[PDB]
Amino acid sequence: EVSQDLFNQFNLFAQYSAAAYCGKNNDAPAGTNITCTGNACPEVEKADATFLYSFEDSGVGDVTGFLALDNTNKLIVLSFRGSRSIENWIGNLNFDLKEINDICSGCRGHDGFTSSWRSVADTLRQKVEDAVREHPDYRVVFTGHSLGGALATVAGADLRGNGYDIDVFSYGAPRVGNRAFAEFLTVQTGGTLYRITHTNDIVPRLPPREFGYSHSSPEYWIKSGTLVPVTRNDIVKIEGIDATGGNNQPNIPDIPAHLWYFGLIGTCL
């Protein structure tokens, strides 16, 4: 119930996200070819994708990932890694709803993710912006899996409106704030958020609704299973803030489900 091109972007940004976990990708010098062990990102490799800036342990609660240049596809890709360190895992646990009026009046977000981002904003924005300047025809995309998708979503909400569009693609990403931010995230202009979920994966269900959190709309729910290659028919676009017809359901949740977004993700060494 999605087109072939959309599907193909979903898989491309999923492989970009997967590539934020391979250790070598977080301390590579600028200009080098992004590569991944275990066939974690063939399209990424296929595109001739170089690093603009590779980073490890940035700001607060460990910001890890990279900023890449993709000439084949005309992209300036900023990718955040999900949870891997003690700090990362612990940053998840700072779940109080902080006010973030600077992004949107009345909206509130996870204290640890609102924080990490804030910790690295200025530098990463700078760098996003010098590439933007140098290649004005390239499409800016922010992405990430798990915590890395929450980093992506917040940074997108923050940096839009600075003169170029920012698309965001998050995979199995946690809820990031309250109903007012979820609302902001659904209608914001200057980029589209594509929030992809996998079957009953547990992570997009946390923190729970009992905690005051909500999800932006819409949701791209992949329904095929763990280790089963996905197809364009496998994805259904579920409409509505806090819909219950996708991953936000009252059933038993699943962990492995998180590691399979079109291919293995979160497993790169």
Residue from 70, 167, 201, 234 carrying the catalytic annotation: 201
* Residue 140: partners with Cβ closer than 8 Å, 6 or more residues away: 75, 76, 78, 128, 132, 164, 165, 166, 167, 191
Q: Is the dihedral of CA 185, 187, 189, 195 positive or negative?
A: positive
Nearest to residue 193, comparing CAs of 219, 167, 223, 229? 167
Q: Which of 110, 145, 198, 258 is catalytic?
A: 258
201 is catalytic: yes
Place of tokens 């933007």: 132
Catalytic site residue 258? yes
∠ Cα 91 67 48 (to 5°): 135
Catalytic-residue membership of 215: no
Cis peptide before 207 (omega within 30 of 0): yes
Identify whether 42 is preceded by a cis peptide bond (ω within 30 of 0): no
Give bridge partners of residue 53 from the DSSP assignment. 67
User: In one letter, which amino acid is 110?
Assistant: H
- Which residues on adjacent β-strands are paired with residue 140? 76, 166
| DSSP β-bridge partners for residue 67 | 53, 78
Set 116, 146, 170, 217: catalytic member: 146
- Closest among 208, 212, 209, 219 to 245, alpha carbons compared: 219
Catalytic amino acids? 146, 201, 258
